[PDB]
Ligand binder design. Sequence first.
Ligand code: SPH
Ligand code: SPH
Lengths: 48, 48, 240, 240, 41, 41, 246, 287, 49, 99
Amino acid sequence: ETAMLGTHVIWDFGLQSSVSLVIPWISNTHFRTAKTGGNYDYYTAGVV
Amino acid sequence: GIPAELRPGTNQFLTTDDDTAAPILPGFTPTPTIHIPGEVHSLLELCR
Amino acid sequence: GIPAELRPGTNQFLTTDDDTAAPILPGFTPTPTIHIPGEVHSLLELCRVETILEVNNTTEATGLTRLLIPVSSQNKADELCAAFMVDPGRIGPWQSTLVGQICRYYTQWSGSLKVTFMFTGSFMATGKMLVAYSPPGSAQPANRETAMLGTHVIWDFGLQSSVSLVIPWISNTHFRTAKTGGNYDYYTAGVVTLWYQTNYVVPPETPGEAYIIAMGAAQDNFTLKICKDTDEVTQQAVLQ
Amino acid sequence: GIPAELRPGTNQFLTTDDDTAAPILPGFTPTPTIHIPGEVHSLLELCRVETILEVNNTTEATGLTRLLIPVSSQNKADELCAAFMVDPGRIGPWQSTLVGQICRYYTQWSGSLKVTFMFTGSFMATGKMLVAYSPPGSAQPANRETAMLGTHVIWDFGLQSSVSLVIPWISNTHFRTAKTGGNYDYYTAGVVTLWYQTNYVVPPETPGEAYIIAMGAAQDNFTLKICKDTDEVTQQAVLQ
Amino acid sequence: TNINYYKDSYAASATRQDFTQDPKKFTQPVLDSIRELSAPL
Amino acid sequence: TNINYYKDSYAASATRQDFTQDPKKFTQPVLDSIRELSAPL
Amino acid sequence: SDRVAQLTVGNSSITTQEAANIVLAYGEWPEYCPDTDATAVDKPTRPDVSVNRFYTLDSKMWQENSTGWYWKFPDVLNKTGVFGQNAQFHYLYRSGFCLHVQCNASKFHQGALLVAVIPEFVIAGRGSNTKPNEAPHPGFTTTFPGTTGATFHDPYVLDSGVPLSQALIYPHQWVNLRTNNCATVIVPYINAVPFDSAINHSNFGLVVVPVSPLKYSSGATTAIPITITIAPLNSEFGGLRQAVSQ
Amino acid sequence: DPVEDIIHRAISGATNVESAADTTPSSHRLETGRVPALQAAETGATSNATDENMIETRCVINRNGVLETTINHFFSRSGLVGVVNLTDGGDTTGYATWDIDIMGFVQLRRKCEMFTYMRFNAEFTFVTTTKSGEARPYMLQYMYVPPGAPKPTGRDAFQWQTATNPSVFVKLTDPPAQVSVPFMSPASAYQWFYDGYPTFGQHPETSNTTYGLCPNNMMGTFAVRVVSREASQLKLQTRVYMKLKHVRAWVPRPIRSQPYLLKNFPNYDSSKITNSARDRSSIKQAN
Amino acid sequence: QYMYVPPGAPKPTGRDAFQWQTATNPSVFVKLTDPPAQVSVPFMSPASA
Amino acid sequence: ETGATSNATDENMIETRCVINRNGVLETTINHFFSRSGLVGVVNLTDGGDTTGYATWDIDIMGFVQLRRKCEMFTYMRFNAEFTFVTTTKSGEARPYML
Ligand SMILES: CCCCCCCCCCCCC/C=C/[C@H](O)[C@H](N)CO
Ligand SMILES: CCCCCCCCCCCCC/C=C/[C@H](O)[C@H](N)CO
């Protein structure tokens, strides 16, 4: 009920067994440095 | 309202009087008629 | 003043009379109207809509099982699943439909009716049913070699689980009075029976007993007339 | 004579019925009219005019002090000066207004109202007040950090001592019935509160307590309907 | 389109309705026009 | 060709009849038109 | 082609394999209130993507004896999301809803649910008492159950004293385990007034009633959850004030 | 232009149909993949299967009229919405008061409750008589008391001066009294079902009696007395009939299946549930 | 009170019965001293004659 | 102080939408406000008591309240009038006597 508040897709097993979740670019800065941890958690993209 | 004066012959029921009466079924269309042979109009046909 | 003569029908209150009465609020403009979706004009729209029809009644089934009729694997071939009389104004299955409740405010009815059956069984179950309509002149058929002699449809469980049996308008008179029983059996419409065409086949490890939901409505030739007051409701005393 | 049939509604006297009656003076020409200034046509003109509104009631203030509400230097900041509910047809402040008396002859009302505050303090006194209108859904705000969440005006004592708080028409229904209390609280308009924005500052050797006169009226969208008979006056017996 | 059954006009009905307003005489009876968007004094 | 004896229109009679039907909104409230002769699914 | 389908609103998306078409209630789309129909003079706020989007509620586990459930829409969403916060700070509310019900099951399961949107759905008291002062009244939490929903005592009358067989006169869709695994209905805003309070008034209810019961064979999956997804659509708010949740 | 995203029908239509639908001649069809019979009831759309497609029909030009089924002829019939008992001689008393509710009892209530919203005018007719049915030349006063107007507190009260409240003076031997009423709701339609509360605040789970009530349906009070200074000794009963005219109806709904227990509330008794139908002997035997 | 009861409508079971509310069944209220009551009836047969 | 009421409107004070108002202003005209009839006097006649035989009522519409309070919100009124006489017995009954 919290996780629905973000971008999500409801996917139904069937013929055509694959689904695609796109995760849009959503960041204050134009770029994100790939290094993480420490004070570089500033750049974390999110959790899926 | 419009002035009026009632006359003799008020509140009398004359059985042969030709008038209109209030309809009991508003918006009523009767069963459609069909051709029945032998329609009579005057009794003189019957007499001849 | 203008001479005038009063007639019979003076000082009478006819409840259906169409007249004008003195307004109690001079110079009154009502609250402006707004768009509300769903405006209805005639009751016939209301009639054409399919509504749940109760077939199973008996003394059993309690509340909601009355809507369902069972289908199951039959040992003896050519067996009768269910039946009922198709007069909508008669006490019976049609009282649960909304076409059957709206035709109880009216004396007579004319038009074609349609009955819809939807099969709620499992995807892996198959079968064929025969639903037939027999115009009057006899009681319900004893066997389906008789029932095939009337209007019928042979229906095959599959994708698209619903079928529609239309029951054409077939009567000597243009209209049929909704009252039945007694000498009003003259107006009986007929009986619709529901037969097993072949059987009800199911694979192993799958439920062997299923349900057909039944449905009813009217078509564009269906009309009513002579509006009366319905008998479905009663009141013992004033309602506080 | 011409045939005719009498209907229900014969020989009834409907007090609001619009008819003609037989004149008692044939060939009567009335005294010629002359120009009298101040002719009124609709009561809405009468409604738009601001009238003294009583806020202070209590058991005290006697006759004319009821019209005034005090403002004075406050030790604790962010304090509430006065409040009242803005329903004009409800018993309360609006009974002293002439818009509130004319809306008691009518069942319903729709439109925007405006409230005017004029500051009668001395020329050398300054201050800022916050007057806010809170649409329904809660009792009056406890603190003005809540009261700022509604429609409000921040007003500054100065030359041009009057300010106008308009209270827009904000209701689900097009009209609001003037009756209140009980289940008619459904129609409550809201509460208008009057807060100290900063403080009331005064130089030395000048009165430290002043008065704000309050005022009320209607705007050009304000209308009424369903004229009734008012409850403000009673009579115990015939008046000799 | 009203009707009078007598030749005395005062016996008639509510006659014709009318819509007329000039609250300006009660609301703003002032000799110097105050523009509504500008300071009064 | 009806008549109103008062200037308040709500005092009138049944006024004029009318014939209007769009059962389509109750019967078929579906966003993909189903051709009546073809398979629904 | 018609079976498969995908919705989208806001940042949320739904895909369905086995769906059967879509129901558009009363043949009208949700709209903003026109200038002629409007009454309140304030400028309403139109949040769009922050409000309009799919919200998923907790799931109901459907059991062989299940009697059905119901919800009230400008209720379930009052305490959840940004939609819920606008609803508590605003006195006036208007919007339509896009509604989606989802129940999976195998080709070896059988049963049918009736999904229906029934405007101004008023539950009733259950008892034989004819005296108005001692008569039972159906609780607060039974009338506005909130997100968790409430269950029928006797679904045959829909708790309204009205036959369920005629519930097909309402915008409705069947979810039949052999045919489709989901039901979808779009509801325009309907009411006698242009705006109405969200916390006091419930425009319409939803009813999922298991007409034909749930039946399967030993060894099949027993737990069959039911999940509902609702998208407030084309929303409007007005009459801003402090938060009132009750 | 500086930002792009700020830069941004129905389904069917109504056909005027004066008479019932006709029928066109059809013949046998044998071919594949054309099947008017197979329908899907899951889609929520009713069967579009017609006569002409299912079996062979003749050419029938139908003259049967559809007019009598319009909602505007369906409510054109008058019905009894209330009955008020007045005894002028008993103790003090002297007046009778009746709060206007057309839900008072059944037949007309059950009709109006198959629509959620109704806008319309009304015509009230007052049939007054003695408990014995006889008529006597006494004059009566019927005063309508809109919401918020003070109610009569006695037979001699000043409330009856009626400088504003519309009144009807009629003698008891005369024909019934009849008046037209406009649409007086503060909303745009009457609504017979309101799910919600009239006020904000707490809502106990013990006594909810506030629930269900719609203030927009409260039209106030109808009062009646007999005009004299001395109290007459008689008993009297006033039946109120109303035609319902210029009617519009929205979002229809099902009829009441169960007997009505209360006037303002849709309560029923859950032990007595009627199972609207008639019981039968098994299935597969029709009468 | 003269109430017409079309075929299939429930008949009055007593003077106080709810049958007399007449929300549908057309009625005629007339005092006994007044002129006779008179109404028009259409052709109501389900057949053509 | 100027004696003129506030000319501040809605559109100027806060942000408003476009509202086209269909509400009628007609019912508030003075000519529909007095169209309602009211009781201006009541006169008691006893023909049997002593000699007497007649009743006299000097015409004043200030006789009592509700209608008086309405007409006194204007200083000057010009108008026509329509009088209606409802007569009955002290018991309320009617009897075929000519008056
Ligand atoms: C001289 C007496 C005239 C009386 C005029 C009153 C007319 C009232 C308006 C029509 C009735 C409105 C519909 C009634 C609503 C419902 O019955 C209840 N208020 C809700 O339970
Ligand atoms: C057959 C009887 C007809 C009576 C006709 C008399 C009409 C009188 C003219 C209208 C009333 C004039 C207004 C009355 C003035 C005040 O009530 C008092 N004179 C002042 O206190």
